[PDB]
């Protein structure tokens, strides 16, 4: 027997890094009473099968780490040294700071006299790294305090992209899942470095290749992904839409789209109204003075019943498909090859290979993560991806889909729990000031007169009511609706988002900041500005695993602590393997994990920190009064704790929901106290509670479905790797979203050899059907108002069809496709002293700002220092040899890094001039390790995209000089 594990208790966990969701096994000494002695992969997990990339494989070094925080640390104003402090004192003082700030800042009514009941002097960042139960309770604590500036990781990389998928399919989530990649016949990786940033995915990517798939990587750089793909096609930065526009034209011209799929399941047959037009790069309804569109000019022609008119013949000139063909005929191969830099040979090769998946016996998938989609037309980039897949019949089928790879382990869940300023849990919107009543709130949900359109969002009044009764089970929903804060209706929505919080920070408009599970001192663009702007805070609360650049910004580079008067509280949380809870991976698998070792030293799980902190705020309001104490004192926190401790199990049951009294929903009698079996049984009269309607089904009376580790599969399930009995995915265990589009109108799969669902013996067999109904009776996209996959998407600010507008401001001056050079609905200086395109990306070995991985000696061993990857052409132009220390500078700042000269970066040919791109990792910071370097964000601009409210971190002008 192995001595290292002989007397150690074995528990299972889920990796705390990227959204792959790999399973671990943890061995804890002394039968669970000691520290962790080993952390490695779970051989029984269906996604990774015991394998781990270096970040997951080093989690033992992350947990058993003598550099971790051990106790709360207090930093008085103008002090130069931390002082160790107890947990009781730390949370008492912060509770005083929260109440003092809230009382002096609480606006019960806005300037228009409408109820808002909010405080705008406190902002909160984070976090996708917390458990789902912790994320949900955290958001509700903040909103019970009246906060509206609530943001986290998802805003920066995902939120620019998910409106593209919701417009296209009705949901913003990744459509398929990791195991499903092995069923694809052609994998297009574009805007993703999956082998480095989602490494275990290449288990399934390569298994697809074993079955004959072609792997295509489209990337401005040659990466570790590119070495293992069949085709590497370089593309210059920002040319993704011309690339995809050419593929659309290719598919349409050569009649490679799946006509029966396109005719029945997309909106190709819908008749657009005569007011739609497109000339000179401008759609109709353009307000040139305000640089905005009148989207009503793009509306469909409606019949006498309000339903959009349909020509199933697809011959009407105002049919979507015909208007689509007209729009993309400009994207010929020669124009696309010139602007992308991709050879005409390579374009034809890639177009032919991927468009071949339009046959029903072939499946194509597109993988993207962040790439360069943060800019204004990033949403249109992903829209074109979705349109390509709808044309080829790839949505809802095994091996198909738009696999938008999520970032952090629980960025899906943290978004599901509403840790963004515009959404409650369950993607119910944060109401604005004009939604004065719950009835007015529910009136905004669109209805549809189409009998075949499920329009599942019409059930929203049940979900808002049950969510409110999860928070306030004895007030009626219309009354508790007045407890939660509202945003201003006449204010731009991005004013509440990530970037404006940093700008309001720099203007001193924030008294306190919650840096909960984030490192904004390195993660936010323009670090010099943000680090100086944090000194304009009254108090800062940082909850993390280690002391870091945000906790200790007051003693950062160039800072004088005696001049900075911010009061910083550092609260050390425990690592993932030291607590129980669930995380939702990219494919929406909500996976339960267990505590291995006890929390190290006196660290506490986030759930216990925020609960005890909120209790101190609650008790201080119960003995002092203050501004609007109602939502703090009535909040249901009894279902959150057990044995004087935050209970992940009880919170997860409340998020699932339970009946508050006896009710008969949907032809079935349910008794009080029972768990809700699915969101179809939620009510709007108050008989049901549920913290998140997407979780209704995750924790029923049958037990914790998220904790299921059952590999039982039928032949059809195992052939495509659904694994329906391993954990649980929302919604109601539908593993492949939109799977009704995978069959014909008799219920027969287009691809029987890779069937997702099949109508057999009066029932859908295989995956859980995404939308109940007999075959041929319902449209397959049940979350859409009209029920169809949207090739024409009139809800987008830039137009119903993606159109190329130049994202590169400085080196490009000509648009070959229209008059309009830049986005007409969106002032970079372009100083000639900085002629190179700086960019930031990741490496396999480090995580995010490196706060975690720069503390793990094995990962620092592999990547010890910040580097700067440049071409041989750039190195020869600047006289820089490989391994030399270089100075990269911009209008925002400067740093030193070791140059990596490699043919993996090639110059961009733009309008007859060689334009050079330099690459840097953003994984580094001044605290640790020694000689590691600072963050690349010292160079990035804080000027953000007017659309998205996110700064540019993928194409910013820099200079690089030999030191």
């Amino acid at each position: 027997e192995l001595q290292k594990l002989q007397w150690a208790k074995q528990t299972t966990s889920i990796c705390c890094y990227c959204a792959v969701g790999c399973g671990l096994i943890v061995h804890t000494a002394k039968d669970g009473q000691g520290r962790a002695v080993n952390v490695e992969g779970d051989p029984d997990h269906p996604i990774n099968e015991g394998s781990l990339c270096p970040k997951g494989a080093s989690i033992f070094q992350l947990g058993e780490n003598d550099q971790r925080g051990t106790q709360p640390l207090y930093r008085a104003p103008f002090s130069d040294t931390w002082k160790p402090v107890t947990w009781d004192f730390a949370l008492t003082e912060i509770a005083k700071r929260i109440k003092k700030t809230r009382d002096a800042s609480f606006t019960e009514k806005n300037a228009a006299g409408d109820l808002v009941n909010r405080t705008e002097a406190i902002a909160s960042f984070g976090s996708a790294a917390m458990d789902n139960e912790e994320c949900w309770a955290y958001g509700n604590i903040l909103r019970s305090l009246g906060l509206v500036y609530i943001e986290h990781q998802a805003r920066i990389x995902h939120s620019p992209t998910v409106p593209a998928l919701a417009e296209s399919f009705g949901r913003g989530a990744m459509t398929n899942h990791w195991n499903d990649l092995a069923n694809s016949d052609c994998i297009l990786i574009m805007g993703s470095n999956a082998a480095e940033n989602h490494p275990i995915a290449f288990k399934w990517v390569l298994r697809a290749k074993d079955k004959g798939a072609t792997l295509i990587h489209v990337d401005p750089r040659f990466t570790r992904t590119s070495a293992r793909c069949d085709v590497y096609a370089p593309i210059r930065s920002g040319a993704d839409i011309p690339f995809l526009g050419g593929l659309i034209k290719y598919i349409l011209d050569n009649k490679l789209y799946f006509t029966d799929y396109v005719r029945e399941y997309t909106n190709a047959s819908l008749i657009v109204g005569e007011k739609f037009s497109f000339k000179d790069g401008l759609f109709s309804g353009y307000d040139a003075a305000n640089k905005k569109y009148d989207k009503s000019m793009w509306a469909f022609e409606l019949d006498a019943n309000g339903v959009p008119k349909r020509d199933p013949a697809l011959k009407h000139p105002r049919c979507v498909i015909n208007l689509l063909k007209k729009h993309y005929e400009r994207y010929n191969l020669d124009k696309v090859a010139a602007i992308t830099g991709t050879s005409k040979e390579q374009l034809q090769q890639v177009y032919k290979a991927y468009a071949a998946t339009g046959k029903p016996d072939k499946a194509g998938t597109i993988m993207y993560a962040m790439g360069w989609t943060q800019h204004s037309v990033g949403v249109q980039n992903i829209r074109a991806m979705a349109m390509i897949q709808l044309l080829l019949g790839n949505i809802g089928v095994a091996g198909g889909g738009v696999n938008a790879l999520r970032g952090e382990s629980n960025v899906q869940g943290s978004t599901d729990q509403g840790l963004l300023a515009h959404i409650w849990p369950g993607y119910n919107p944060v109401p604005n000031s004009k939604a004065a009543t719950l009835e007015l709130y529910n009136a905004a949900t669109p209805q549809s007169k189409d009998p075949m359109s499920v329009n599942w969002w019409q059930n929203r009044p049940k979900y808002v009511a049950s969510y409110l009764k999860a928070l306030y089970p004895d007030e009626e929903p219309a009354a508790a609706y007045d407890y939660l804060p509202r945003i201003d209706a006449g204010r731009k929505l991005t004013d509440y988002f990530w970037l404006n919080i940093f700008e309001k920070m720099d203007k001193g408009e924030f008294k306190g900041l919650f840096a909960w599970g984030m490192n904004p001192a390195c993660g936010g663009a323009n670090a010099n500005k943000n680090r100086k702007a944090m000194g304009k805070l009254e108090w800062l609360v940082n909850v993390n695993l280690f002391e870091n650049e945000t906790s200790s910004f007051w003693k950062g580079p160039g800072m004088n602590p005696a001049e900075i008067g911010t009061e910083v509280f550092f609260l050390p949380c425990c690592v993932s393997i030291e607590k129980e809870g669930s995380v939702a991976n990219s494919g929406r698998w909500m996976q339960w994990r267990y505590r291995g070792p006890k929390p190290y030293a006196e660290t506490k799980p986030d759930g216990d920190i925020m609960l005890d902190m909120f209790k101190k705020v609650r008790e201080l309001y119960a003995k002092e009064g203050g501004a609007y104490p109602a939502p703090i004192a009535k909040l249901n926190i009894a279902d959150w704790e057990e044995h004087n401790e935050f209970s992940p199990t009880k919170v997860a049951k409340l998020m699932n929901g339970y009946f508050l009294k006896d009710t008969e929903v949907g032809g079935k009698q349910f008794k009080k106290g029972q768990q809700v079996p699915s969101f179809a049984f939620l009510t709007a009269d108050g008989s049901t509670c549920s913290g998140n309607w997407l979780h209704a089904g995750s924790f029923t009376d049958a037990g914790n479905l998220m904790a299921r580790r059952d590999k039982t599969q039928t032949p059809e399930q195992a052939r495509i790797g659904l694994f329906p009995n391993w954990s649980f995915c929302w919604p109601v265990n539908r593993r492949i979203l939109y799977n009704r589009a995978s069959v014909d109108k008799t219920g027969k799969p287009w691809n029987p050899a890779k069937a997702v669902i099949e109508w057999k013996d009066g029932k859908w067999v295989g995956d859980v059907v995404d939308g109940g109904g007999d075959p041929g009776t319902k449209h397959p996209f049940i979350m859409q108002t009209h029920g169809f996959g949207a090739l024409y998407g009139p809800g987008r600010e830039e137009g119903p069809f993606p159109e190329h507008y130049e994202p590169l401001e400085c080196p490009v001056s000509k648009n070959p496709f229209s008059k309009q050079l830049h986005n007409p609905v969106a002032k970079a200086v372009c100083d000639p002293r900085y002629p190179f395109i700086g960019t930031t990306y990741r490496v396999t070995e480090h995580w995010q700002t490196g706060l975690m991985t720069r503390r793990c000696a094995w990962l620092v061993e592999a990547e010890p220092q910040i580097f700067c990857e440049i071409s041989k052409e750039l190195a020869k132009l600047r006289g820089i040899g490989n391994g030399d220390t270089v100075k990269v500078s911009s209008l925002r700042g400067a740093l030193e890094a070791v140059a990596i000269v490699t043919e993996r970066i090639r110059p961009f040919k733009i309008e007859g001039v060689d334009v050079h791109m330099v690459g840097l990792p953003w994984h580094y910071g001044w605290m640790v390790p020694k000689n590691g370097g600072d963050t690349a964000n010292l160079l990035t601009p804080s000027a953000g995209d007017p659309n998205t409210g996110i700064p540019e971190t993928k194409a910013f002008m820099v200079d690089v000089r030999k030191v």
Binding site: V39, F202, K203, A227, Y232, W858, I900
Partner: protein
């Protein structure tokens, strides 16, 4: 005996195997600098039994040929490191007759360290300047003799790493070689009749490392 089949045509240079080797043995990390390469540590050492080497070869057309080589002791069937060590002291180097692993014992501090390394045609052995013992990959024989796969094999997501009895791994290596040759015509096996760590190189093995093959 046991055997590794290492299919470098599937390696993504994720370096999970480099870390998993250190995690299982609780090995310390080296002091490393970046000198113009993602490769680190730059070489095997007393506390680094496996490092992934990066080599960039040019090719016409877009991109490069990026060659990844997770180096480790080959565990030769007839290990010359044992012959040179048996000159000074027999027992310093031991061959496990059930698994086939070549194992360094604590008596390697009793032998001439540099002579044992020079006898290995793969330049695998490394010596600690203070304890004077020899260290290298030990096949994770502890895990192998307890029914577990070596740490570097279990952690590998791509299917590059494979482990089992020598007969079944050669049959796998032969079958995989014929399939890999369709995409990499210069695919070769590294000394498949003499070693228990059988690498599949996509091109000339010397392009991966100077001592990739004997």
């Amino acid at each position: 005996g046991k055997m590794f089949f290492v299919d470098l045509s599937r390696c993504t240079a994720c370096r999970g195997c480099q870390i998993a080797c250190k995690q299982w043995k609780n090995l310390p990390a080296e002091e490393t600098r970046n000198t113009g390469s993602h490769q680190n540590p730059p070489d095997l050492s007393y506390v680094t039994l496996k490092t992934v080497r990066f080599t960039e070869k040019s090719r016409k057309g877009p991109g490069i040929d990026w060659l990844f080589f997770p180096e480790q002791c080959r565990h030769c069937v007839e290990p010359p490191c044992k012959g040179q060590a048996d000159v000074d002291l027999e027992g310093a180097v031991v061959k496990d007759e059930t698994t086939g692993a070549v194992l360094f014992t604590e008596l390697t501090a009793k032998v001439d360290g540099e002579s044992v390394r020079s006898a290995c045609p793969y330049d695998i052995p490394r010596i600690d300047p203070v304890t004077k013992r020899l260290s290298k990959c030990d096949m994770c024989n502890d895990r192998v003799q307890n029914g577990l796969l070596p740490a570097c094999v279990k952690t590998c997501p791509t299917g590059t790493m494979n482990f089992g009895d020598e007969q079944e791994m050669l049959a796998l290596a032969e079958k995989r070689l014929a399939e890999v040759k369709k995409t990499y015509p210069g695919a070769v096996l590294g000394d498949p009749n003499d070693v228990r760590v059988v690498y599949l190189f996509t091109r000339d093995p010397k392009d991966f490392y100077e001592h990739a093959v004997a």
